[PDB]
Amino acid sequence: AMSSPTRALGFLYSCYGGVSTDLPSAYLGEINSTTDEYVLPYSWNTDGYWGAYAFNTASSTNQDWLWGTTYQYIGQCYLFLQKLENAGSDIASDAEKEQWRAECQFLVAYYHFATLRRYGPIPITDSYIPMDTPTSEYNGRFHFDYCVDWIANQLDEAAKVLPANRTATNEWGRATSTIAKAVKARLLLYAASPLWNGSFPYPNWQNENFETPGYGKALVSNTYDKSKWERALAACQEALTLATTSGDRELYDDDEYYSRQSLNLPFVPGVADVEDNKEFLKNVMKMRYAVSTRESEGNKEIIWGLSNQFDFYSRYPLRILKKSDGTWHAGYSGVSPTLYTFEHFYTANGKLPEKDLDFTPSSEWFESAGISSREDIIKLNVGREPRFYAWMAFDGGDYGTKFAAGSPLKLEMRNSEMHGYNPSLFNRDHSVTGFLTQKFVDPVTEFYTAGGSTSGTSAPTILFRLAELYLNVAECHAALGNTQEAIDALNPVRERAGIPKLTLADITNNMTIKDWVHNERFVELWNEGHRFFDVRRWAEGAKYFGANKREGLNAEVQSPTFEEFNKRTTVDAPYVWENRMYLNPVFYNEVYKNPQMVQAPGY
Ligand SMILES: OC[C@H]1O[C@@H](O)[C@H](O)[C@@H](O)[C@H]1O
Ligand SMILES: [Ca+2]
Ligand SMILES: [Cs+]
Ligand SMILES: [Cs+]
Ligand SMILES: [Cs+]
Ligand SMILES: [K+]
Numbered sequence: 078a079m080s081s082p083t084r085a086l087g088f089l090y091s092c093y094g095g096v097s098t099d100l101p102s103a104y105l106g107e108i109n110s111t112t113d114e115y116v117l118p119y120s121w122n123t124d125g126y127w128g129a130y131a132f133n134t135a136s137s138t139n140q141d142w143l144w145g146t147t148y149q150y151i152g153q154c155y156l157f158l159q160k161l162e163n164a165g166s167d168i169a170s171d172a173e174k175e176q177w178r179a180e181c182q183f184l185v186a187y188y189h190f191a192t193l194r195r196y197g198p199i200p201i202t203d204s205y206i207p208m209d210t211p212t213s214e215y216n217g218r219f220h221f222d223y224c225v226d227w228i229a230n231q232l233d234e235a236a237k238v239l240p241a242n243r244t245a246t247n248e249w250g251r252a253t254s255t256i257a258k259a260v261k262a263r264l265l266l267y268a269a270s271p272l273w274n275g276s277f278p279y280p281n282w283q284n285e286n287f288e289t290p291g292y293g294k295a296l297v298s299n300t301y302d303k304s305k306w307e308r309a310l311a312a313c314q315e316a317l318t319l320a321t322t323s324g325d326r327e328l329y330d331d332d333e334y335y336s337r338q339s340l341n342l343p344f345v346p347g348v349a350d351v352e353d354n355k356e357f358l359k360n361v362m363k364m365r366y367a368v369s370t371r372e373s374e375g376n377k378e379i380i381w382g383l384s385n386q387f388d389f390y391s392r393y394p395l396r397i398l399k400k401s402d403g404t405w406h407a408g409y410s411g412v413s414p415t416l417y418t419f420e421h422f423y424t425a426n427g428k429l430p431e432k433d434l435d436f437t438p439s440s441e442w443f444e445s446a447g448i449s450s451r452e453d454i455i456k457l458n459v460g461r462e463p464r465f466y467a468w469m470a471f472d473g474g475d476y477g478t479k480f481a482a483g484s485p486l487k488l489e490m491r492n493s494e495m496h497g498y499n500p501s502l503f504n505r506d507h508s509v510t511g512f513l514t515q516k517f518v519d520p521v522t523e524f525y526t527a528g529g530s531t532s533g534t535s536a537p538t539i540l541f542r543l544a545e546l547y548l549n550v551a552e553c554h555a556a557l558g559n560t561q562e563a564i565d566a567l568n569p570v571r572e573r574a575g576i577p578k579l580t581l582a583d584i585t586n587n588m589t590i591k592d593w594v595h596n597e598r599f600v601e602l603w604n605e606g607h608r609f610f611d612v613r614r615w616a617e618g619a620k621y622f623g624a625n626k627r628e629g630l631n632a633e634v635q636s637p638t639f640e641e642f643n644k645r646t647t648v649d650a651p652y653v654w655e656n657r658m659y660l661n662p663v664f665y666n667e668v669y670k671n672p673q674m675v676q677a678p679g680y
């Protein structure tokens with residue numbers, strides 16, 4: 078029970094059990110595969126929950142009940158805390174008890190946050206609830222702003238006690254003050270956002286028979302409050318300062334890991350491997366490693382990462398390599414980046430393709446770039462930023478480095494017997510848009526002719542990393558009209574990625590400071606489980622997630638010509654946006670079970 082130090086530690090370990098909820102980058106997860114970043118084949122809607130959320134068929138009886146999990150571990154935390162109060166000096170010292178209490182405090186707060194960000198106003202559960210508790214005493218939802226204040230206060234208390242950094246020695250990353258402050262930063266940032274700060278779509282949604290101190294039956298603010306941005310800024314600043322001092326965090330900036338691993342610099346159209354281009358090409362590899370390495374490999378950017386892995390086959394091309402037995406190594410090729418993605422990664426000059434005077438006019442984006450032996454490469458895919466070539470892949474281009482028996486795999490997205498659409502051969506699997514991503518793919522990844530393969534060295538799945546803290550501070554400054562300081566916050570991230578810094582001159586009526594911040598966030602944290610939340614908190618669901626917004630190439634036709642393939646094509650699946658989609662529906666049974674609980678609007 079708590080009959081010994083090792084038993085107690087085991088109990089504490091089990092309290093961390095819910096932290097993988099809504100895991101970033103997991104391809105079947107709705108926070109990953111329902112945004113305008115990329116789409117999955119419509120026929121994959123039978124797998125997981127992503128379909129129900131993308132196509133608005135989620136319901137109180139058809140939903141991902143992560144609430145079940147978060148409050149489960151919240152209860153586990155308070156159960157632990159209860160037993161610990163009765164535990165003697167034989168179990169743990171007073172100093173260690175203090176540490177354990179802080180860890181639980183952080184976990185409870187985080188678990189509430191994980192629930193809040195999906196469900197909106199939630200019941201605050203700050204004790205263990207005995208199963209014989211009368212139904213009349215169940216908490217209902219507390220007003221969003223009440224929830225925010227409590228979570229924030231809990232994180233601040235934990236932060237007083239927890240260490241700022243820990244050495245990574247195993248797969249259990251225990252809480253730090255740095256993580257506590259980072260969570261609070263993202264929390265307040267969300268809270269200051271339009272959805273929760275003046276633009277909630279259902280102003281009249283409220284409690285029926287439950288009161289929040291300070292708010293009565295109200296559940297969400299309907300009035301813009303600038304002070305929320307002020308507090309968010311201070312919180313984001315503090316998180317950044319902590320992380321970069323006693324947190325011992327810094328942006329991954331190693332330009333030579335590829336070299337130490339005996340790899341060639343990557344092929345990039347229009348950027349040959351010559352002396353003058355070394356910096357650009359090394360930046361491409363830097364950005365591949367930045368999101369696929371361990372601290373033991375020199376990465377000090379991760380604030381909170383998990384040992385939990387996510388699947389890669391879903392992003393690999395179809396036929397990878399023919400084995401000596403005549404059979405093929407194959408991927409699923411389902412993770413399909415949209416034209417929105419391909420149009421909002423930057424040009425080499427650090428600008429949007431549409432906006433960049435030095436970039437191809439949109440009228441010519443789908444023409445061949447005329448690259449010898451790679452004529453399939455269209456002009457849109459030439460002249461882009463390092464992050465583009467690091468993380469994206471396209472017809473005529475290379476996928477990976479060691480990928481196919483030690484060589485990069487050239488993509489043939491129009492070939493029905495290689496990487497193109499062909500249900501008779503590949504069943505459900507194909508790129509929906511004619512693009513692919515190789516983000517998170519270890520450069521050492523390699524499939525062998527003799528059979529078997531390697532994915533190099535695994536890396537933690539990232540929950541919080543330092544680049545985000547820069548972006549969070551930038552967004553707060555932007556909201557407050559601090560233009561130079563917003564710029565100052567973005568520039569370390571831009572500089573690391575090998576594109577030009579911003580100046581005041583770049584802020585105009587054609588590209589606002591908010592445009593820059595939001596787009597830098599779109600790019601840097603692409604496929605890291607942010608866009609789902611960011612579009613929602615910005616109250617821009619209809620704009621970005623609505624019907625017909627998602628586009629790609631003409632990729633669901635067999636054996637197309639170059640000309641047939643390279644046409645702007647609406648993704649042909651029943652994507653929609655409706656306002657109820659901002660919030661996750663509450664499990665039917667829970668609404669029934671808790672008399673004080675109210676369903677999300679529209680469900
Ligand atoms: O989730 C989609 C995937 O589902 C698997 O069960 C299948 O083996 C893959 O080919 C791919 O279709
Ligand atoms: Ca790796
Ligand atoms: Cs309003
Ligand atoms: Cs242009
Ligand atoms: Cs109810
Ligand atoms: K660490």
Ligand SMILES: [K+]
Pocket residue numbers: 436437456457458459460
């Ligand atoms: K171009």
